[PDB]
Ligand binder design. Sequence first.
Ligand SMILES: [K+]
Ligand SMILES: [K+]
Ligand SMILES: [K+]
Ligand SMILES: [K+]
Ligand SMILES: [K+]
Ligand SMILES: [K+]
Ligand SMILES: [K+]
Ligand SMILES: [K+]
Lengths: 367, 367
Amino acid sequence: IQCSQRMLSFSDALLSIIATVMILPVTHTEISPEQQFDRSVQRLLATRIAVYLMTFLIVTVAWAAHTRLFQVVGKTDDTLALLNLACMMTITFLPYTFSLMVTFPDVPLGIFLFCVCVIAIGVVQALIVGYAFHFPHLLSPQIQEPLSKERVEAFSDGVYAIVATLLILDICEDNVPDPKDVKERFSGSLVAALSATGPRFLAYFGSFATVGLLWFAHHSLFLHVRKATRAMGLLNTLSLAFVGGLPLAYQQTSAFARQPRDELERVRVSCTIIFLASIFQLAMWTTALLHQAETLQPSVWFGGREHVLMFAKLALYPCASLLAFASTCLLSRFSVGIFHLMQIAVPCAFLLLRLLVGLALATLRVL
Amino acid sequence: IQCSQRMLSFSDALLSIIATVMILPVTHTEISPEQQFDRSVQRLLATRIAVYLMTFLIVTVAWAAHTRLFQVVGKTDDTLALLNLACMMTITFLPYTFSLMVTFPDVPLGIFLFCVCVIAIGVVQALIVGYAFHFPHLLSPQIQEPLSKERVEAFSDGVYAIVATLLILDICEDNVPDPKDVKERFSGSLVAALSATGPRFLAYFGSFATVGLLWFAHHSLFLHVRKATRAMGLLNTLSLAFVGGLPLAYQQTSAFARQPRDELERVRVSCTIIFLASIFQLAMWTTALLHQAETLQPSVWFGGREHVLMFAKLALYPCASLLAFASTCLLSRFSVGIFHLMQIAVPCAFLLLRLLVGLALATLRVL
Ligand SMILES: [K+]
Ligand SMILES: [K+]
Ligand SMILES: [K+]
Ligand SMILES: [K+]
Ligand SMILES: [K+]
Ligand SMILES: [K+]
Ligand SMILES: [K+]
Ligand SMILES: [K+]
């Protein structure tokens, strides 16, 4: 009989990979230069987005069920590890089957495959439960609503890492100049061929910075969380789902724009995605504040030392996104520059957040 | 001031993603149907393999340094988390710069970029050290050879998950039938279009099973490890590097073969990769046995309860690979069938390993 922590961490990593499988088609969608094709291209992209959102949810539900199952099976053994591997393997087919079901609505085989995968997941989990109850010493002591904060943190960390490294993975695969290309299409200059790839690196820069800072806020919040809840888990799931869309937004804000309005609308979309990703972290914090006695450490309670700093940390990005979005409507001519200035400023504000909070508190105290 | 466990887990996940970036070009290499191109294609593939092996090592070294740095910085704070994010960002560019250096040997800019990335990593880590020494309370208590088993386990888990899900990621991106294709090239049968994708799913099946069982052996070993060492870390790095090549081997053993000798040689390669991945886990165990008093729990000491079972668990796959490799030379006509029978048997042996070990021990006792 063994401790289950490493096995559950491995399962969380696998589930995080599977939950994000359908983002690659979205980011690998090519921004066509011909605007006349837009109507078609958009129709594809939106669909690819919708599927991504559904899959991430469905897998999340499975993950949640897993998190509950092994709250009832505390200690693991060899048989349970092998069975959990089987369960992970079954879960890995959910995205493909759902994608096939949506791609072939009128073919009854797609729904059959998806339902059979769901049934197989259920069967393996029931086998795990039966095995653990046949050997009672593998059950949790209380067996012989809250979600395990451990699993939430691990799953979120995996999702954040994948989303932060998506664009660098794509660059490392696709954008190493061909030695022959550097000759004819760049007159032998590796400098020029690399410079012709600047926009993609700027996109990776922006995406990694934003995802890392959102992870930083999430990490700061869950460092103070005594107990996670189902509502908090749902809000975290929504936040991660919208975090997945940040690399796309940053790709679109570095591409070439024939018309300024395209730049403006891409900025709008980017700010909207950032706001959606961050407002649900803030909602997580606010919902936890409803039951701070049970969910939060005293430090972040109302009147605590770290309450205001935590609120500022979790409300920074939403406020910045809202300000940029409002500028796009009221200060259009400067909106793109404001967006870039925000991309530079927000990391600096996170760096100097404590001093800024103290300064604001003192200023309001004297005022 | 904060506990550093979640930040280090996040860093391990990022580093595991970066260490495996250069495997995607290897697995995305297309098995050409024209044998006359082989000489060229092989030359590419081997090169893509070599780079993958170098990058995985270089990143590993960085990871190792990281693991040491935060053995000296025990507790973290906001500034250190942001600095660690900067360090991760710097590390993410090592694969691209090394690939560019190897792709353009005669251009001095590639070596310059790679060296500058290394220098930037060093600079950020020195900044972390200086900050932690300016605030002594962030240092480890012993500051105010062994590698952290925590980091080794997390890094290995991430690598294993990525390698296990590579092929399903590729399938989910590429191999959902086009609705138009199902019409003309398959006469409207979704069943037939899915069946024409069977080999890839068999490859994923095989790869996931093998990677999961290797992870199972690694997990069983490190459940009994009191202290990890530098030599053990090097052997684990080698094992993970050769684990990365299993999806390729399983792709090659499901592709079409005009000549039986191609099948035989692909089987040889697959068995060799499995043997290389597993023999280093066994070497890890054997090296730990040199200092069991310091590195291992009593259960797995010589004469302990779990010594023989652990040895069998870590020597199963190497023995099976060796047997299949020998069959390919002595029982060529049956070698492919023996390979498939082994792919079925090894999971069953892991499932019934305890009973088989007991049976063998009793049989030798009576004999
Ligand atoms: K973890
Ligand atoms: K992960
Ligand atoms: K990926
Ligand atoms: K971990
Ligand atoms: K991982
Ligand atoms: K991962
Ligand atoms: K990954
Ligand atoms: K990947």
